[PDB]
Amino acid sequence: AREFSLEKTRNIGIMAHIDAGKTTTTERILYYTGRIHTSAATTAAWEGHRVNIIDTPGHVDFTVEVERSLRVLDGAVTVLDAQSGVEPQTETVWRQATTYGVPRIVFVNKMDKLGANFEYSVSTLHDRLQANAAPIQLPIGAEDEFEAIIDLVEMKCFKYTNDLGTEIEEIEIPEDHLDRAEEARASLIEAVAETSDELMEKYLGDEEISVSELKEAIRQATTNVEFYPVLCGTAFKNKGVQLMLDAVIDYLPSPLDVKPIIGHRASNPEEEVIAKADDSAEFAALAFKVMTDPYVGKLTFFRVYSGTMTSGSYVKNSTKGKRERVGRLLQMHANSRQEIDTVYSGDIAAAVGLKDTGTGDTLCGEKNDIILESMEFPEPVIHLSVEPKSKADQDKMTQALVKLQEEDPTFHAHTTGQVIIGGMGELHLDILVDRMKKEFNVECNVGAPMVSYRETFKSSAQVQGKFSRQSGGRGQYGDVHIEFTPNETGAGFEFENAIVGGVVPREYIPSVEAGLKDAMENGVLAGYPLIDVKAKLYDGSYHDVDSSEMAFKIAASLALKEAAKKCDPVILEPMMKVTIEMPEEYMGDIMGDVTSRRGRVDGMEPRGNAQVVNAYVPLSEMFGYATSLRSNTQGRGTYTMYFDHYAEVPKSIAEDIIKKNKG
Ligand SMILES: [Cl-]
Ligand SMILES: [K+]
């Protein structure tokens, strides 16, 4: 039976600038929730509750990996430096968490350092973010005088007598602080009642609000992402850390308190599947980290959303379309490793030595096909060539690439030993290359990024392709007439067989189609794949011995070559959907920048004190976008970018592309 109920489970991340003390706060949480008074996830406990502490990345930019982490954790502790409150880095991350429906409590850390100011720090939540945040605590003293904390919910006071976290004394609220405490409690009830009609009716109706009534309302508002409790302390000198952990229990969600994860069936990507926490339901879990341990070998960390799985059983890796035997399962505690037999909905563990299961893969039952992570457009849009410095550097590169694919499912690599890497954007490529060079000690030269262009035809033509040769021992013969016509943008390749009366024998018709496919891949105008073209085979000739599958592949090739002279080919470029969220005062510079990159806007909508812009920008004009965005928003804006459609390149730009590719 499960040790801890669904209701008594807390999946949390810590969100903090390195300057706000993320690592000390993280060390203290691990100490207090451990047994004795770095892991992708630590299994821990507090007050009869399972607490799983999930590592969150330090990215200044929103990556596929940041998004994965928001989907694995359920709640977070946002840590601020008492001297400066919310900084730009803190703000971008906060806006991303709101989009993913993640409840937060705020911990104002460093209350003992020079310049500490609880009231100012709380005011930055209001001004920078328009967040409905209110103190549930008040500090007594600041800097070297920080000495006590008032719990405003219970109306009790806790005094600290040392820097170790022991011998805490409960005292009466000091006389000179009672008015200020009563005032803050009233402010706390008002901010919560803005989200609750029934509470507001009680408050205005001059009724008393019990402790249990107030906690319940705070929890409801918090787990609905309509309210943010604000707490205070100092992690390094152990004051307020135990009260912060009690607040994780009191106010942060169980796996049932947040929106369920959304996936689809492998057999039908348009059919939606909701995976809610339910031990009797079908199993579904998502892999989110892969570690290689010197003793146990490969560790794949996963979060279970629904159902249960037992060690020694077979599951489906639905992303690969392959079965996996789950041989052994580990939970990593602060001071020990623990082997377990079963993992339940809401739980996190690591599977030991999976053959073919990496980060971002879905596991489900053998009989089922739910997928929880994918991209609508999986293909790379930008590529880079990488040249190893030597044999030793070549060998290292081969190893690096295998390990990098386990960690990031969104890049592709093809390896003569020149390697071409394909990815989703300039930052993505830079992160991978950095990891190769620094972490796997590979010495290499890297080329300029190359956007993934395509070609298409703008007009139609009939052409003959005829192949007649005897080199060298006997003749090969193939003869086709084909009509080429442009297809709809996005509709792809379509081959039509209009041969009647066997003028081209049925056994060589698939060869005409396959020959056209292969030739189109090489492009006609600047070396990029030709797409969105229709081709109809309607006449030709043959001989009963001299014709061959091969002869007709070549005949079809010569026909495309003739058609490229007559069908007005053009270069197409990838157009990205660029979604920009920034404080509203930066509209002017954000929109001017979109215009300067040949982009356009289709809809912009307010969200809090922000605007959300739907823009379309050519990928070739997105180099340096994150830098300009950081500069135009004082570090406070964030964005995502995905492939959207192909568009024709302007005439003078295409001429540059052809001039350059001809050297
Ligand atoms: Cl405490
Ligand atoms: K767990």
Curated annotation (Swiss-Prot):
Q: What is its main location?
A: cytoplasm
- Domain of life from the UniProt record: Bacteria
Q: How does it assemble?
A: Has vitronectin-binding activity.
**Which positions bind GTP?**
16-23, 55-59, 109-112
GO MF terms here are:
GTP binding; GTPase activity; translation elongation factor activity
Could you list this entry's UniProt keywords, alphabetically sorted. Cytoplasm, Elongation factor, GTP-binding, Nucleotide-binding, Protein biosynthesis
Which biological process terms from the Gene Ontology are attached to this UniProt entry? ribosome disassembly
Task: Identify its protein family.
Answer: Belongs to the TRAFAC class translation factor GTPase superfamily. Classic translation factor GTPase family. EF-G/EF-2 subfamily.
Q: Where in the cell is it found?
A: Cytoplasm
> Entry's SMART domains?
EFG_C, EFG_IV
Which gene is the coding source of this polypeptide chain?
A: fusA
Q: Does the keyword Chloroplast apply?
A: no
**Organism of origin:** Staphylococcus aureus
Domain tr-type G: start-end pairs: 7-256
> What name does the UniProt record give this protein?
Elongation factor G
Q: Which PANTHER family does the UniProt record give? A: RIBOSOME-RELEASING FACTOR 2, MITOCHONDRIAL, TRANSLATION ELONGATION FACTOR G-RELATED
Q: What does this protein do?
A: Catalyzes the GTP-dependent ribosomal translocation step during translation elongation. During this step, the ribosome changes from the pre-translocational (PRE) to the post-translocational (POST) state as the newly formed A-site-bound peptidyl-tRNA and P-site-bound deacylated tRNA move to the P and E sites, respectively. Catalyzes the coordinated movement of the two tRNA molecules, the mRNA and conformational changes in the ribosome.
Q: Which NCBIfam families match?
A: EF-G, PRK12740.1-3, PRK12740.1-5, small_GTP
Output a single Gene Ontology CC term carried by this record: cytoplasm
